[PDB]
Amino acid sequence: LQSTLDNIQSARPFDELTVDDLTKIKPEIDAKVEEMVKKGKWDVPGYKDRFGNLNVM
Amino acid sequence: MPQLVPFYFMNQLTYGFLLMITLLILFSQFFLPMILRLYVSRLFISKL
Amino acid sequence: MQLVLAAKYIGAGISTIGLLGAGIGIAIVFAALINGVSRNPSIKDTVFPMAILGFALSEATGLFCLMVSFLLLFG
Amino acid sequence: QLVLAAKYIGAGISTIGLLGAGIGIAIVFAALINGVSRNPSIKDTVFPMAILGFALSEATGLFCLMVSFLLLFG
Amino acid sequence: MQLVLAAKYIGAGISTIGLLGAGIGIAIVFAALINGVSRNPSIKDTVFPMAILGFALSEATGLFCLMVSFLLLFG
Amino acid sequence: MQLVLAAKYIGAGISTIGLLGAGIGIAIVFAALINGVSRNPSIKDTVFPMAILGFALSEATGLFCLMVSFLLLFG
Amino acid sequence: MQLVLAAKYIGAGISTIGLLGAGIGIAIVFAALINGVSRNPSIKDTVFPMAILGFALSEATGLFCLMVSFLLLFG
Amino acid sequence: QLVLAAKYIGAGISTIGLLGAGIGIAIVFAALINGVSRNPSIKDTVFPMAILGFALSEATGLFCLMVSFLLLFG
Amino acid sequence: ISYAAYLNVAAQAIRSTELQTASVLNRSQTDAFYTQYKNASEPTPITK
Amino acid sequence: MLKRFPTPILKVYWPFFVAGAAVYYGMSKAADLSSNT
Amino acid sequence: LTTFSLYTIIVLLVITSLYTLTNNNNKIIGSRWLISQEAIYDTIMNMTKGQIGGKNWGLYFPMIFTLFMFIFIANLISMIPYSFALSAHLVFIISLSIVIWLGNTILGLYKHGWVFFSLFVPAGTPLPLVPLLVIIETLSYFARAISLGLRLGSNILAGHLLMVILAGLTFNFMLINLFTLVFGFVPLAMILAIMMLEFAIGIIQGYVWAILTASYLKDAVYLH
Amino acid sequence: KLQFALPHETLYSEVTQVNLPAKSGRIGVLANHVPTVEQLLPGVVEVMEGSNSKKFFISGGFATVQPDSQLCVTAIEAPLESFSENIKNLLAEAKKNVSSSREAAEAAIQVEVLENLQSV
Amino acid sequence: DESILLLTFLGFTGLVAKYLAPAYKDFADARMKKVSDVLNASRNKHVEAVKD
């Protein structure tokens, strides 16, 4: 946990983070994106519950 | 009006329906899921 | 022949009068939207789809009119 | 010649009938929007009635339009 | 001959104007139906048959106008 | 041709009539804006965009009259 | 010829009818202003800019009509 | 002849334009009366508004009128 | 349902979140018996 | 930049494509008719 | 080649650039340009979940997205002051409208049988006028066929034609005597005001297309 | 001036802008307003003094702009954050209540109250 | 003729760049900030969990 705490402090791209880096750190990214396309739901739930969203309607 | 009437309608329509099929595939397979990557990634950071 | 062509262009002018009705109609739907929202701010998300639906349907009569105008003019 | 001219003129005049239908449609939708803002919850009952009302008002406009086509083409 | 045939067509076109009032008429009735039903939530069982009656009667003037239009056009 | 040219100039004037409806239309939208803002003192952030949408749609119906008017007048 | 010169004066007259609509419209906007300001006597500073905006836009439809009148008058 | 006839007709057509203005003036005045009766006390604020509204409503009528005269005289 | 009854039920619902003080809860408690009378004679007493 | 995820619901859009083919054929005949008087 | 083909290629190239250099290789933080195409995603997500909401709502979400973006770009490209209007070749927009309309009618018939025409009985009424209310509902149902196309078509056509005719008048207004050239800027300003309005009403009409052919698709997907 | 008093509290008992939800939609009062009496429906209320805004959940009551520019608001109980989850559980119970019986009207009010709370 | 129309387009882009482009800059900035702030907040959140 000490080492992990040090890892969060000394390494963290977060001003220029790439989704490619997250796809690399977890294949969960691509798995979920593919599962959503396969599911046929293009609204990922929870996204707008802790990020915004806007609409005209 | 002759600027709204060619007789080239089927010519027009060939290139037109080609653009529609192109964009349909292009959005659906390429450009829409790359926005969905941003969303899913954002939610994955949110969970962790 | 000249009488026919004259009548075509006169007839075109006459049809255009119908559009006035649709313009008032469009306004009436929007008047309702503004009034509804002001009378209840929370209604807005439910009402906004219905408003656009109503706008289009109102507009459609005007487009029928406009099509007669274009049938005379271009045709 | 004169007969051909007459059908074109008549077609123009007939198109004016549509004017009323446009006002009509808008009044139905206006009442819908007003109603739903008034009740918050009437909409389930009212919305079928509104679609019925739309159809009937619109139908009058279609009568004007078919007369226009009967003159113009016919 | 040409003038008489022409006069049929012109007369029909002029006649088509009257129909517009009935269109507005149907809407005025339906507006009241919506408004009333939104006021009470419960008037509706009385008010709905009254409204259908109102529709038919307002329509009837329009239908008389449509008859004259057909009499001019075909007749 | 003098007949057809005269028919154009008359027909242009006929088309101009259509604008009247749009003029009333603009007003109906703005009247709603004023009324609504008076109700809430505060709805205006929501309602003011709705008013802009309303202006554009009503005005657009007006432009259809204007373009037909110019098709006869100039064209 | 006589037909063309006549057509200019006739077409001009027809155009003038359209202007009536804008006049009614202008009044409607002012009516809302008076009633609105009555309902909340401090809404005036917010509402009065909105009112002048509504006036100008309603008036503009009238302007376009009057332009077409002058084009027929002098063309 | 026909050109002179057209002046008289044209003027007549323009007179129709005035009808809208008449309604317009009234709508402003109706609002004045309604407003005064509504607040009891808005009157001093509303009176300059009312004068402005009257003038503008009237102005649209004046434009109709001058076109009517213009076709008649010249 | 009287107008003030209408408001009353709403108020009772509003004391439901759970962070609320005892006095709030006490204001929702009540205990009364409306004892009807007539003429002398007394139709039975029953809780509000 | 780009990534590819196939979206297999192009076979749910079968009546849309069928309608496109019918109108395509019909417009061939329309174009030939308009290139005639 | 064909002018129509050349401008369809130009539209394709515009659309590609918004997802291949607008972004910063998919930066999570979000670039100023990439925020635009996020908002577009959200307003069609939240619109087509609202229109054709149901168990399937996302199955037609790519189609409604490329019907948005095609018209959204084609009502900017068609408004460049020296450009060949694909859209004002009305026959392509109207053909596309009729295609979607027929593809709704066929979809509805297939999914909801020959009792698809029960959609055009909208309300209980006495039985001898139940069929009447099918005739003058269906008449209006394929009036939607031509309304959807002609709406957009009229808007685009009217904008270009209005601007060019008034431009031609103001050209000759400034080609005559210089005292009219002075105080001749106000009619140019009228064309400017119309051009400002024409961009607005073109994006509004593109949104109106995609909600209406979602409403028709709502009917087609879900019977009533 | 605003006077907002409740049978167990005295809140605001001038005040710059006040927004009140009434059976007439929503009413906003700023300075003199027409001196109406309007019944307040179960509500989310905002009271603003300067630009600072404080949000109250109001059980409905009566509102009366007085002709002297005194906004008398009286209602049974209220801040908004304090009212705020368990109540969402309660609505499930209330739905059950609609089933059995006066209780229907009561439960209907409960549906209004949860809906209004969920709304904010 | 068409140079008048091009002059109108130039004026149109002038109004857009005058008024809209700073507004859209501010809009874009605002959202960007919100996304970023949420993102960095989430980073904080897990750092808390490590300590817990």
Automatic annotation (TrEMBL), chains C, E, F, G:
Q: Cite a GO CC annotation.
A: proton-transporting two-sector ATPase complex, proton-transporting domain
Q: Name one GO biological process term.
A: proton motive force-driven ATP synthesis
What are the record keywords, sorted? CF(0), Formylation, Hydrogen ion transport, Hydrolase, Ion transport, Lipid-binding, Membrane, Mitochondrion, Transmembrane, Transmembrane helix, Transport
Query: Where does the record place it?
Result: Mitochondrion membrane
The organism sits in which domain of life? Answer: Eukaryota
Membrane-spanning residues: 12-34, 46-74
GO-annotated molecular function: hydrolase activity; lipid binding; proton transmembrane transporter activity
Primary localization: mitochondrion
Limits of the V-ATPase proteolipid subunit C-like domain: 10-72
Membrane topology of the entry:
Multi-pass membrane protein
Mind telling me which SUPFAM superfamilies this protein's record contains? Answer: F1F0 ATP synthase subunit C
Please give one Pfam family short name.
Answer: ATP-synt_C
Respond yes or no to whether keyword Transferase is given for this record. no
What the record says about family reads: Belongs to the ATPase C chain family.
Quaternary data: F-type ATPases have 2 components, CF(1) - the catalytic core - and CF(0) - the membrane proton channel. CF(1) has five subunits: alpha(3), beta(3), gamma(1), delta(1), epsilon(1). CF(0) has three main subunits: a, b and c.
Q: What does this protein do?
A: Mitochondrial membrane ATP synthase (F(1)F(0) ATP synthase or Complex V) produces ATP from ADP in the presence of a proton gradient across the membrane which is generated by electron transport complexes of the respiratory chain. F-type ATPases consist of two structural domains, F(1) - containing the extramembraneous catalytic core and F(0) - containing the membrane proton channel, linked together by a central stalk and a peripheral stalk. During catalysis, ATP synthesis in the catalytic domain of F(1) is coupled via a rotary mechanism of the central stalk subunits to proton translocation.
Q: What is the name attached to this protein's record? A: ATP synthase subunit 9, mitochondrial
Species this protein is from: Saccharomyces cerevisiae (Baker's yeast)
